[PDB]
Design a protein around this ligand. Sequence first.
Ligand code: A1D8D
Lengths: 368, 712
Amino acid sequence: SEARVSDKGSGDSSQVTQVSPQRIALRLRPDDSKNFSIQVRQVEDYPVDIYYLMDLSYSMKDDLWSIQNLGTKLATQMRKLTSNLRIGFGAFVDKPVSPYMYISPPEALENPCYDMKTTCLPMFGYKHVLTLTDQVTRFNEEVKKQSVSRNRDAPEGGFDAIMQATVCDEKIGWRNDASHLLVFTTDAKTHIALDGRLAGIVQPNDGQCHVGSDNHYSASTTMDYPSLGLMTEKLSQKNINLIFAVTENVVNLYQNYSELIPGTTVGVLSMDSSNVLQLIVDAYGKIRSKVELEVRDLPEELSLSFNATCLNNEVIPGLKSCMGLKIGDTVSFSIEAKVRGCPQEKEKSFTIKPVGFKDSLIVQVTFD
Amino acid sequence: LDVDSPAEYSGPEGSYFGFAVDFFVPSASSRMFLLVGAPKANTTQPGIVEGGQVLKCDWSSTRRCQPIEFDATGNRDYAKDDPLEFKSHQWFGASVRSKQDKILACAPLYHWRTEMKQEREVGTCFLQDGTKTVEYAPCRSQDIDADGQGFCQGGFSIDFTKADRVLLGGPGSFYWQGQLISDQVAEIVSKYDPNVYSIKYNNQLATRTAQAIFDDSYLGYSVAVGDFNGDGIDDFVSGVPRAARTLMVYIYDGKNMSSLYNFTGEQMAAYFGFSVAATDINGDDYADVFIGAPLFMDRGSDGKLQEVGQVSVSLQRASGDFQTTKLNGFEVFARFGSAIAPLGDLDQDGFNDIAIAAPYGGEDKGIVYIFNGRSTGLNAQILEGQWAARSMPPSFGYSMKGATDIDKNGYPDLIVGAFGVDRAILYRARPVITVNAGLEVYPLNQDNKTCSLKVSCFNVRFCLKADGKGVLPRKLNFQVELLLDKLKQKGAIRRALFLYSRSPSHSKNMTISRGGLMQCEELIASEFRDKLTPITIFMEYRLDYRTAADTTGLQPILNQFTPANISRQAHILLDCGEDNVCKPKLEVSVDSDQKKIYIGDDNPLTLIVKAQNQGEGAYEAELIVSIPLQADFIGVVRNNEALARLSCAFKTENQTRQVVCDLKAGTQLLAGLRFSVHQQSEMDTSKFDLQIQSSNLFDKVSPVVSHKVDLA
Ligand SMILES: CC(C)(C)c1cc(Br)cc([C@@H](CN(C(=O)CN)C(=O)c2cc(O)cc(Nc3ncc(O)cn3)c2)C(=O)O)c1
């Protein structure tokens, strides 16, 4: 009864194997229960999705730079943290309705800054110009080309931008296996779920995407701002890490805002955008992944058993997974086989699939 | 309130019918009108669309809703190529009020060609004075700027003052700070001149501007009136939902416009101040304050935040002795709060009440809660919008008004709007009936045996009365139900019975009239083994609602409190009454007189039985002469030197030998107690005790016995 493994390298960019030697051969007979051990230490970076949200209203007279600077820094900051980064953006000013959108003269519709002897693009719905792409260079180029528009009242409706961002899975992008970060930038006491009465807008915000064929938010003029509890629901449902990245004039209000929506944290926008970069890194330590193995191509025989010699030298029979693995943790799995009966075959093999992992464990048995 | 047979209305598609609701009445006439806004209706008036209407729907016999006296009167012009008003962007019907013969219908999104420039901004209200109709626009008086009353949206919320003043609320009257405007009705109608577009009224009292810290507070978002300092004039309370760092409600004196106490919440973004109601719950004329926080969210049962909403009751008492309490919601995202409708004596049995609604709760459709008021308040009915969504959430309960009676009620009836479905429903309040009742046991045991064939005959009481105030049918057909003995299992038995029928229960039909007169009925209440457990008397009652409704079909209702289901106890002599406290002292002992008996189907082993209890009520005392396995009472003793009729019954359920013998003093009812002891197990050798089963001998401590027999 022989059993001989081959891939002793503990991970590499070229040597992409994240496991021990993963090719094991053995010679056995019926009821020859053999044992061997594998190390599945994970040395791969973590996946992430980041969404950048802006107000970009006339309240941002000269505060638009703070939004533009953070988006670029947030892009390059997490690239260092991880190479699995996907980034994008989407913008929102306020609802296109009577008390905000400057509907009375024919001149204002194309320019609500007409009376101020300056131009501003017509105030719009939630329009995101970029889906999550690995192109970092396209994100900061596109995100810097957008400008501001004007609404009548000081509060802005960037809360609808959060709600649409967290429900439009494919229009702007969401990966199932990655962590999701949503940074929302504003500088005003945003409308909260009931300001649409003054606008004739009396439809509660929904957990549905409404970007539509055009990039503009279709329901921006017929449904209200989202509830603060609704944003709590959709955020945790889709594993969104929200960051109320706001200004110092309203940080205290948004601090007390975060204590009501769990998992949320704030950051004072400025030239030194470190109020949020040291925040997204905090979320990096909370998105630690897990290791789990699977069985495939097994020819209805060759029973397998696993022992969970997982973190901090803890042993528990039967288990086959341990959670909360940072990069570099060496979880081992002592695997024992159990062959039954006599298959009508001489050479057979089958593969063990570490879930989520590129490599796999393959065992070949020559038997009679 | 009544939900089974309400009255419903509808209008043009997408018209937002029911967004605002109130009650029009005629002067000393019964042709009351249920005014209801239709702010998005297409206007059947010249040269204008998107105007909206205020529809008068009658009270009964018809569903017709027709527009106001102001009809077929379109956009007025300013010049040959400029309309005086930018109407077709307005919301006529967003707020409706009526007091005796007046209408205050306002269009917060109305625009008008301004005079200072060519822009468009203001809100307008169209009163009615009998036949004459006038225009009200307090935010149109040369204050044409966003800095002032240009974006006023005046009339968004309005209210009536007992001094015949009208309290108008425009949240945008300032830079969305808001303002209360109060003008006398006589001054408004008298100063009417259509060629003048900014009519000024001399006795106007309005809130002035504040600092830049106050902004977007929406002072005129919700309004109500009451007396909060005690001078006979209605003060102005207002819903400021976004004040004090979006954490408020303002109170202003009626004739001074001075600032009285302000109310603030502790939660954030809850919209504390979406609706405000002014009524009395505690009992003193000092009116209370109610504040709505429809977006309130607190720690839940699982330790996580959940948005359920919350309201605040302010028991404002003189000399600063204020007390406050908070009422929480029940359904997540239901927006409990929202429309707080000050009702009044919805139940006349006490003082006023408050209706709080959840526009987005229930299955799929809107929910309405009811909070009845008692002394000190702190009383922390359900209605659903069974109408299904068409293309919009059916925001049932968003608009509500239940301050005015419309029938022979005294109770105020409730109007509910469902603008998201283009409909409005009338919830007519129901006549409350309070009830009180009781019963007790009069009668000695051995003298009842002479009641007729002879049975036992007792007596109890049969007294119930309802009375109750209000206008409702004088005679009410009550159904009452009583039980002879309760707490019985489905297989348990009865002890006291009605001799005339032997029924263990009886229910009675009575058409009792409304009055203080006391009405009671008359009735008289050795074959049963149960003595110790007390007889339980129970009382149940109900009302044939279907026939008790009036001609209008308004269903009567009994008191929502007063839980009924009441019951009492009783006890009878000769069960254990021979003992004053029925406490027993068992010392139940038996002995194994014979010893050294051979093992295996030999002559039966002889034992002795005696009693030791001295309790006076030693009825039914049990003789469970327990034996080990492989034994039975073979050879029942016939000599019976002192034995009684104790004949045992035997069974071996769950390997437990029954051998149950039965019997008022410790007496040696003794005879040879025999047992087969047919032990077939040769490896065993040789536990005898008397088990307790007599309730009359049962106690928390049972002095028993324990002995064994010697075998060779
Ligand atoms: C251009 C910018 C960045 C300024 C801007 C962007 C957007 Br989008 C919307 C606005 C509004 C809101 N607003 C502000 O943004 C500034 N707070 C104010 O309205 C404002 C200003 C005050 O200087 C005092 C007060 N308070 C007040 N209100 C009424 C009154 O009779 C007296 N005082 C209120 C506006 O000024 O028209 C401005």
